[PDB]
User: Fold this.
Amino acid sequence: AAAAAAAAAAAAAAAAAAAAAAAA
Amino acid sequence: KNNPVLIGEPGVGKTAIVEGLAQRIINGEVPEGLKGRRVLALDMGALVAGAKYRGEFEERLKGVLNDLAKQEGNVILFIDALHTMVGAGKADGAMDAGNMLKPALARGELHCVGATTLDEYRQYIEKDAALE
Amino acid sequence: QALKKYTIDLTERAEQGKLDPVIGRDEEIRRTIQVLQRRTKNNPVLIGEPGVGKTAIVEGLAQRIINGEVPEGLKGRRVLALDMGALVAGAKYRGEFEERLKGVLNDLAKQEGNVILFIDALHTMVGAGKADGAMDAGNMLKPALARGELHCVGATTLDEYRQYIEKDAALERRFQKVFVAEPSVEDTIAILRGLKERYELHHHVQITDPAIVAAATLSHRYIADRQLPDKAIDLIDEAASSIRMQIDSPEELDRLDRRIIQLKLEQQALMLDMLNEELSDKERQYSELEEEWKAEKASLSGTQTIKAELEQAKIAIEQARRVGDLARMSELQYGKIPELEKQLEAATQLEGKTMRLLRNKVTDAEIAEVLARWTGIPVSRMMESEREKLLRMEQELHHRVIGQNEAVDAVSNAIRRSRAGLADPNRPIGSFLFLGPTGVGKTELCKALANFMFDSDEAMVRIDMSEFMEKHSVSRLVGAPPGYVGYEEGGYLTEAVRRRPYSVILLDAVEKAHPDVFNILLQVLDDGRLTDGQGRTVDFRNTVVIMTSNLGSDLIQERFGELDYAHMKELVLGVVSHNFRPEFINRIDEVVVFHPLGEQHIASIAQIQLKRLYKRLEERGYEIHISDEALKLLSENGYDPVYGARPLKRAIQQQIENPLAQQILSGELVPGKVIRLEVNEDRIVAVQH
Amino acid sequence: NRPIGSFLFLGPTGVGKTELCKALANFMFDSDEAMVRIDMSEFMEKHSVSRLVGAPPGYVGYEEGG
Amino acid sequence: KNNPVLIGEPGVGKTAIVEGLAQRIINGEVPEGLKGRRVLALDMGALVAGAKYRGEFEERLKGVLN
Amino acid sequence: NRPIGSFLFLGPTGVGKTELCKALANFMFDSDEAMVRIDMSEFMEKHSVSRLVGAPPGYVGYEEGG
Ligand SMILES: Nc1ncnc2c1ncn2[C@@H]1O[C@H](COP(=O)(O)OP(=O)(O)OP(O)(O)=S)[C@@H](O)[C@H]1O
Ligand SMILES: Nc1ncnc2c1ncn2[C@@H]1O[C@H](COP(=O)(O)OP(=O)(O)OP(O)(O)=S)[C@@H](O)[C@H]1O
Ligand SMILES: Nc1ncnc2c1ncn2[C@@H]1O[C@H](COP(=O)(O)OP(=O)(O)OP(O)(O)=S)[C@@H](O)[C@H]1O
Ligand SMILES: Nc1ncnc2c1ncn2[C@@H]1O[C@H](COP(=O)(O)OP(=O)(O)OP(O)(O)=S)[C@@H](O)[C@H]1O
Ligand SMILES: Nc1ncnc2c1ncn2[C@@H]1O[C@H](COP(=O)(O)OP(=O)(O)OP(O)(O)=S)[C@@H](O)[C@H]1O
Ligand SMILES: Nc1ncnc2c1ncn2[C@@H]1O[C@H](COP(=O)(O)OP(=O)(O)OP(O)(O)=S)[C@@H](O)[C@H]1O
Assistant:
């Protein structure tokens, strides 16, 4: 008789940047 | 708070200063209060690598901590890449290395030696205030 | 019972006294005793900004319980601290976390309010130990949290509280917000008195109490970084350790030991002599120093053992206050306390006689030394080499800066108030605006201050302000606000101060920026705070900021004669009033005027450049002398009112190095001939004789 | 509906405006900085409103708020 | 610090420069400290086969190092 | 301290100034295409200095330099 385990399955997000772009 | 961490621009031999400390211990040139001590290097990667099961990383780490309790203030443990232990076992909804060690250093009970790079210090530690 | 198997009993180790005396807090421990003593939701969680003694407050609760200083309903309780890693650890199989957790909760049911469960770092628990086939460790407790079937005591830092708990506001509102304040100065004073007792129990040494309040004042002033009381406790512990290591070995004994082993090796190499007699004499001196050192160590050891016996008597009378033997109280008091205290003070005054190379106390010099090696702000009290070097201030300016007496004076004054303690703890140490025509020291004094104060030229945070003609250009000195580009690496500046917070900051060429760049400096020169985008503050009350322009250059060339310095300053003040904003220069300590150079200045300058020239040609392998007439030619070459000293520099460069290196890579010049720079008829010859 | 009492101060500086507010803070709360002293020269440009309110969600400025 | 890196704008065949190094090693045009070495290539992506579990990546890398 | 030469040439049109500096490079670097030829007359209004320095952080050209 064999039992189970529990796994990680881990990773991160994906990010953004954002850029002002000045007028004058 | 028994724990220094070495900060510089990287290169300038922080790992070297830890080893030269270790030699002056081995030479018996340090003052007496830490004579006969052990200095051992901690791997992150030796701890992490097998533990693809739940919780096994915490058990590896706690068994090491209880070994360090068993040696009873004789071993000066060393961690290179302190900013690596910040997110070390930082798994999905689990415990990292940090939020196990965060009681285990501000009770004096261990004597870890830190060696980080100042940009990774800003990256990974003065975000994360308790460990700092 | 797994309550044994997965907890810490605080109450035992409090009764065992492994914990710390907790002072103040009676409002806050009161309010915790309140929030435990409810019907639903007995769960306070300590929101505490990091290190203000959150674990200390839970410890102080448990120590009052073992004392029984509480309301009656908490008398006889238990408090068990929870290792989450113990709850996670063995759960290699699926489900085992949940078994351990439910078993501990059912045993908490079976202990029936006796055990007040404790959790530190409660932001760990929200999503702890989880995976896809899990119960995620928040869901398992939340009904018991709502109905108060549990007495969870929480302790987490504010930042983790926001980030990690209130990503589910239900499992926020199950708990109760208990705010810890900032402990003040006097709070820190009291808490340090208690742990002063504790740290002398550890570290075998003696502490002056005005040194403690000095440590509190300095730590509140000079570390922007942790919070109280933890930084002043840090100062106490590190100064005690420095005392301990200065006890553990002596420096003059180390130098004399190197001396005697050198003399021993020399004598053994010799085998008239008299070196044998010198070795015997130095070994006698070292032995005398050693025996004094050992005897005063033994005096310290006896003093510390009887201090420890005093502490054990305090332990016994606290045990008698717990238990309640009656004549034992007055017996132990009147026996143990006053005689051991008076011969403790007799050994203390015997040390205060005898301590010679040899420290036993923690005074303010030790705290200052640990600070000044902990950060680098020079607060520690002077060695007289340092103090006379501060009195060799202006001479060592004139080894770089000829003339220029006004700013020599003012900058000397500023650094004197820097070390003197008379500085404002609200401004940076000196605000400085510099005026003069181009090239009479406005870079040079600042490189000289680096070369004097820090003893290196190019370590001065030189934010050259040429670039800043556009109102973009604040964000390359105070970072970029989040989600934009430069969030994760800050500004150039706030690194370059919060690294090394005693450092001269040049703003070179102030007037050629945008006109209002400089309201950043309104923040600076008022109050020394300057918060970049990423949240963080910067103190400026340990640096020196110097600004350079050339505005009154027409007026300086105009009226350098025929006026006093007062109307000169006034009239160029009117000029800057035409140029700068009246908010700004009101924040300036002194506007000086550089005065234009005369010819003996130029001669001195040319001499210094020849000195560095001879240095450059030294590693080349060549020595050179000059005709003094050739120097007089260069005096005739390198004068003009309109430009100052740079035409001398390029004139020297041409008229010397072009014939010189012309002859050099003519392949001619054997080293060794010290080259007279005697003159040509209008040029200068380099000769081989 | 409203805060307690808002103020704009005027006059040429160094006549005790910022120091008056710090004296209020020394009164009411017993610190200079335990108060929110944000000088506005951090805020000369359009984009740095996110230094005070913060980043909208889904970025890097999502873990330190405002 | 035995590890130098190759650099430029691409389309210059630095891959082939490593190849020609290995060919000279085959031919023995090298100094007497490299005769008999093993020039082996490895992708970082070659060990991103199973990147969910914890340490799996790192166990691959440590097994490589051992 | 100072960089090595610093030269403000004066002369009328076509007297070889550009070709002087190219001959310098073609001596020194065996080409003309090893020189920094920043063509300066693009700059007739001020605020293209960010072409040469870079753009300050929190504007567009922060990842790229000038
Ligand atoms: N004070 C020193 N005395 C002798 N050797 C030194 C000294 N400082 C550095 N080194 C040597 O210089 C090198 C520095 O290596 P590291 O100790 O890795 O430097 P590092 O600062 O740790 O670099 P990082 O930051 O870890 S990537 C080693 O070869 C050291 O032996
Ligand atoms: N009232 C107090 N009595 C005694 N020691 C105190 C007191 N306040 C603070 N301390 C000390 O300050 C430190 C507080 O330790 P902790 O409470 O663990 O820090 P913290 O406030 O919990 O922040 P964290 O969660 O541990 S990062 C310890 O050195 C305590 O001895
Ligand atoms: N008192 C002095 N002693 C020695 N050299 C000096 C002195 N004053 C100026 N110099 C020379 O001045 C040169 C640089 O002039 P700077 O002072 O940099 O010009 P400035 O005064 O800063 O005004 P700017 O910044 O050039 S517009 C250096 O190479 C120094 O050799
Ligand atoms: N009534 C006052 N009591 C005490 N100090 C005062 C008073 N009026 C002015 N000061 C001083 O003048 C300065 C006033 O500081 P601030 O309040 O910052 O100046 P301000 O009036 O706020 O205008 P700015 O914006 O700072 S120029 C400080 O150096 C105070 O010491
Ligand atoms: N000396 C050479 N002899 C023969 N082929 C060469 C030589 N140098 C370059 N090449 C060829 O040039 C091709 C492309 O150059 P690469 O070195 O592959 O480009 P790269 O700059 O290395 O970037 P990648 O990732 O390798 S495409 C190589 O695959 C070779 O086939
Ligand atoms: N002494 C010379 N030797 C070689 N070519 C020369 C000489 N004098 C002029 N030239 C030529 O003159 C031209 C100069 O080109 P450029 O230097 O670009 O013009 P320019 O010198 O920039 O003049 P301006 O003032 O910018 S229009 C080239 O075609 C050169 O070949």
User: Anything to note?
Assistant: The longest strand of chain C covers residues 115-120. The CA atoms of residues 380 and 635 of chain C lie 46 Å apart. Chains C and E do not touch (no CB pair under 8 Å). The first helix of chain C runs from residue 2 to 5.
